C-alpha cells in the first residue's frame with residue numbers, strides 16, 4: 001500500500017539528463033531494486049534529452065524551478081508526500097523547490113554533492129599554490145555578476161564571491177535569494193523546516209566543487225578565499241534565517257561524508273547509507 005512506498009523525485013546535475021542508462025537511469029533501477037513498488041520520477045527540463053543537457057547549463061534556474069514545481073503538481077502519486085534526491089547542482093535546485101513550492105509536500109531531501117553556498121573556484125584549479133587559478137575566479141566577478149550573463153548561465157547563478165560579497169548579494173538571482181542574503185523570506189524558512197530530514201552527502205576528495213565545504217552548507221570565511229568555516233559558525237545559522245539551526249536542534253539535518261572525488265560512490269555505499277532515507 002502507498003503508505004509503504006514513498007515516491008522519489010530525482011533532479012540530475014549539470015551535463016547529465018533525466019534518463020541515461022549509465023547515470024540517472026542507473027540510480028532509478030537501483031532504487032527500484034530494493035524498494036519494491038516505489039514510483040520514481042526523474043525530472044526532465046525540456047522536451048528532449050538534448051534540451052535537458054543544454055538546459056543544465058543555459059536555462060535560468062528560477063525558470064527551471066517554476067517548471068518543475070508545475071510538474072510535481074500535476075502528478076497525483078506525489079500529492080501525499082515525496083522524497084527527493086539531487087545530484088550535484090540538482091541538490092540546491094531541489095532545495096529551492098522545497099523552499100518555494102510546499103505542495104505537494106517534500107519529505108526527505110537527499111543532497112548528493114550539492115553546492116548550498118555555491119562555488120568560488122574552477123574544477124581542478126586549486127588556488128592555494130597557483131597564481132593563474134586564483135586570478136581567474138577573482139576576475140570572473142564582473143562577468144558572473146553581469147545582468148545578462150547572470151540570467152543565461154546556470155553556474156553563474158550559484159557562483160559565490162566571498163571577497164566582494166556585497167556584489168554577490170546584490171546581483172545573484174538564485175543562490176542569494178534562496179540563501180536569504182538580502183532579506184529573510186518567511187515562507188522559505190517555514191517551508192524548509194517543514195521537511196523531515198535534510199541529508200547532505202559530501203565527497204571528501206572532491207576536486208570539482210570549490211570549496212568542498214559547500215556540500216555541508218559551509219564556505220570560505222567572508223573577506224577572503226583561503227580559509228573556510230562550517231555552517232554552524234556562519235551568520236545564516238547564527239541568526240537562523242532559514243530555520244537551519246532549529247532543524248539541526250530537532251535532528252532534521254544529517255551530515256554524511258565518504259572518500260572519493262565528485263559523485264564517486266559504490267552500489268554498496270548507496271545501499272548502506274541512502275536507500276534507508278528512502279525506504
Ligand SMILES: *[C@H]1O[C@H](CO)[C@@H](O[C@@H]2O[C@H](CO)[C@@H](O)[C@H](O)[C@H]2NC(C)=O)[C@H](O)[C@H]1NC(C)=O
Nearest residue numbers: 203204205206207212213257258259260261264
Ligand atoms: C582524499 O583526499 C583528501 C584531501 O582532501 C584526503 O584527506 C583527508 O581529509 C583531510 C583533507 O581533506 C585530511 O586532513 C585528512 O588527514 C584525510 N583523512 C585521513 C585519512 O586522515 C583523504 O584522506 C583522501 N582519501 C582518498 C580517497 O584518497
Ligand SMILES: *S(=O)(=O)CCCCCCCCCCCCCCCC
Nearest residue numbers: 013014088089119140143144155156
Ligand atoms: S554539478 O556537475 O552539477 C556541480 C557544479 C560544480 C561546480 C562546477 C561549476 C564551475 C562553474 C565555473 C563557471 C562560473 C561561471 C562564471 C561565468 C562568468 C562569465
Ligand SMILES: *[C@@H]1O[C@H](CO)[C@@H](O)[C@H](O)[C@H]1NC(C)=O
Nearest residue numbers: 099100177184185186187188
Ligand atoms: C518569499 O518568496 C516567494 C517566492 O519568490 C515570494 O513570492 C514571496 O513574496 C516572498 N515572501 C513570502 C514570505 O512569501
Ligand SMILES: *[C@H]1O[C@H](CO)[C@@H](O)[C@H](O)[C@H]1NC(C)=O
Nearest residue numbers: 164165166167168169170171
Ligand atoms: C547593492 O545594493 C546595496 C543596497 O542598496 C547598495 O549598497 C548598492 O546599491 C549595492 N551595493 C554594492 C556596494 O554593490
